[PDB]
Subunit: 227 residues, 4 copies
């Protein structure tokens, strides 16, 4: 059974200031937190600079001056489904995330194959075959601890096998993931995952992620770049 | 000027489930997130075990079975004031936190000195002296880039100099901090900081941090231990 | 083509003391480094305790007192071949290692399947099938950027596909890997990898890794435990 | 008592290839390791490109193509003395190092103060004063657990108090430390520490660290930059 990518933003930072701090801002949550952490460094809760007085303007300055460490206080959790095991192998290479993965048939078809009906059929026949071989092996094994027979038979399962993964990281880790994977260089499936995560995070925190440019490439696949 | 420790919980995880997941729980936020991440691993959104069906019971099981990695999805940010530079040096040794520290007179008196009026006066006279020496040096320097004269004169400032720090970490990092520092072994000031952070987190997430026992020791200082 | 696990220790720490430190020890390299770092903490280069004067005795004490952070200064690099992609996915979940993996036919047969000639043939026929499907797809694609056709066709490759990986970490990270994976709980393939890494490290640093007990289980698979 | 900065390279990576790999290179140790890890990724042990056949040329290419992750396999340990507690507080902010610090009178004089005999005397009189106050407090305390009286009296010790620290990290972590701290922006004392660490590492691994430019500034303080 063929499944498509699904990215859902399931967690985010909720911010509340200490009451005894003379400071307020034009935004709530993660982006207010980031501003708070910045002002906490220099004791600028009274906003002495008229240029960087607003949240959006404040966060934009943090960026240029390269104080991206401030981004580490804000957090986001994605629940990702419809991602292959091979793309998940790439995703877990990013070591500042925290993961909870589905303990290892639904399958993920590469879009270049999905776009050609005749290749798709050929692909799915190869998937059925893998699954037939898995069952034929698992039954041969269990015949003659039984977690051991399944973990052995799994060896036959394809890269395309769907995984599901909870992934948490701070905004700095997200920006780095997206910067590496959403660029045109990158593997197609992980690029799509990154663009989709970005899209969710551009909604959640428009200024932190605003500098990223989503373009549709000619092949209809999307990409993102930043200065 | 003498200041006391202040710990304020300024950020926490807000959780919202994907609509298309047949699962609900008896709690909101961080602890619901942790449960979600656990069920996501094994696809137990339908709750097949009557023992671990509730959130509190579910999280308690996670603990015993040692799946503490699930705790990494939940986050907490403290704003800490009234903490000495020496205690902050100990705090930043914990490398899975993210920090934003006040860029380096308010001072922190060790409680053993604070409890004796005559020692306290002796301590504060030593603090005034440090501050007199700081100014007398900074003025000698600036006389004959001027960020360089202050950073040189600072060399004379005591360990007791107050710092202020924004500190973020996931629940696993918090549990580890508290486990190491809230134990009787630990330095007094960092122990107090840990107990206070724990107290805030026991309010925020009673089951995750419930297993920690706060005792008052004989000297009136508090401690925390866990099995 | 079937390949077996190969673990090779390709890098280790070389230690040389500063000449101006009045200290010498009965061992060279990594374990001398660890002792040096310990004595550097407390200024015990002159060895005041007759019990913990020797390296082996010194390192054994570090262990009991739980100063395992001293182990972080010593490093080891393994080159691992004959490891499946699924076991490599488990290996890279350990986030304090550094990895360089073979950029993705040689295959790894699970030992439970390898031990039965008839299952093995069935397994290898499933491997040939995967490979036939890979080529038949890659040729269909390239017919009608060409890094994109291979990365799409790979989707069909099994978990068993051999990977090769350079893996570096400090002794603390190694001890943790081995502690989690070499225990009887663990997946068979990753357990074998861990035992083998341990065996190499027990040769390289006998006292650091000496407390780990390698037993052969009844099924002829090996295991390791520690107090 | 006044002490000066001392940086000593006490550990480095020793490399030995697996015998069964048809590959040799024109260098030993850390830089051969880095090349090995690169070739392991792409199976280029036979050197197909005449441009990047030598180690120095190979490592230089790794740099431009931004595969700096290869640098993580190589390790270096410094023993640093004559570093103030305030500079050590900055140093430990770099979270991918491993540290063993002297458990907290020798003092470190800021060079801007050291260069003026009259300021130096003023500084050292402030240091004697801090030390007199420390003893006068510790004796008042111990009069009326005794690790608690010293840790309280320490509160009075200045930033300038000498620390000693064992610091380990991989070449990537070193490059990042040096990149942030050796630049003209940076605090003077931590800049000097970074330049000195660089100087040691330029000897140890000339190609990995060769791109860093050490200039003497007008004030006689040194700096380092890289493209
Ligand atoms: C052109 C290119 C080709 C590559 N080819 C391969 C390949 O064939 N095989 C392969 O295995 N890898 C390859 N890599 C590297 C691999 O893609 C990355 O290592 C992986 O995606 C993890 O990302 P990261 O290294 O940025 O670190 P992450 O784990 O995402 O961490 C983010 C940042 O934190 C820092 N960091 C985290 N941990 C450490 C640490 N232990 N030491 C120092 N700094 C740390 C680094 O600054 C890093 O940039 C390649 C990279 C590039 C650019
Ligand atoms: C009795 C005792 C005495 C000590 N004395 C001294 C002393 O005199 N001087 C001194 O400098 N330190 C000393 N330490 C160690 C020091 O207290 C800790 O290193 C510091 O508090 C950081 O905590 P952590 O090591 O648990 O790691 P954290 O940085 O808090 O990380 C938490 C966990 O993540 C893991 N981790 C993080 N980074 C790495 C990594 N790079 N490699 C492997 N694992 C990692 C470890 O599992 C660690 O437990 C002592 C420790 C003990 C128990
Ligand atoms: C019974 C059991 C079942 C599990 N089931 C699943 C499952 O179904 N799916 C799944 O995805 N995972 C599962 N896990 C967890 C998974 O095996 C581990 O997360 C993975 O092996 C990485 O190991 P580690 O978590 O010890 O951390 P490593 O990355 O190996 O790091 C070593 C140590 O450093 C510290 N550390 C490193 N990074 C951080 C951080 N960001 N925050 C706080 N501390 C950190 C921790 O102390 C950690 O112990 C399970 C674990 C157990 C015990
Ligand atoms: C202009 C400027 C002003 C600053 N002012 C202040 C200040 O007033 N107060 C203050 O406290 N700090 C300040 N900082 C930040 C502080 O200097 C750094 O946070 C500190 O030196 C640690 O360095 P690092 O952040 O590069 O990370 P390191 O800990 O050195 O790690 C190296 C790299 O690994 C990655 N990394 C490691 N851990 C994580 C993580 N948890 N999440 C995501 N990525 C990670 C990052 O890519 C990082 O660049 C300032 C920074 C700049 C540029």
């Amino acid at each position: 059974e063929q499944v498509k990518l699904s990215v859902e933003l399931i967690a985010c930072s909720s911010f509340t200031p200490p009451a005894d701090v003379e400071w307020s801002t034009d935004v709530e949550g993660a982006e207010a937190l980031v501003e708070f952490a910045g002002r906490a460094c220099y004791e600028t809760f009274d906003k002495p600079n008229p240029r960087t007085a607003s949240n959006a303007a404040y966060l934009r300055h943090i960026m240029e001056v390269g104080h991206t460490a401030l981004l580490e206080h804000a957090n986001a959790t994605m629940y990702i489904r419809g991602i292959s095991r091979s793309a998940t192998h790439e995703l877990v290479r990013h070591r500042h995330f925290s993961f909870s993965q589905l303990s290892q048939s639904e399958v993920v078809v590469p879009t270049l194959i999905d776009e050609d009906p005749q290749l798709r059929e050929l692909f799915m026949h190869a998937m059925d075959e893998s699954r037939f071989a898995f069952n034929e092996l698992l039954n041969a094994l269990e015949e003659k601890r039984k977690k051991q027979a399944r973990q052995a038979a799994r060896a036959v399962l394809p890269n395309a096998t769907e995984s599901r993964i909870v992934v948490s990281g701070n905004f700095r880790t997200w920006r780095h993931f997206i910067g590496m994977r959403a660029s045109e260089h990158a593997d197609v499936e992980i690029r799509e995952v990154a663009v989709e995560c970005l899209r969710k995070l551009q909604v959640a925190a428009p200024t932190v992620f605003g500098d990223f440019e989503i373009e549709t490439l000619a092949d209809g696949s999307q990409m993102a770049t930043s200065p």
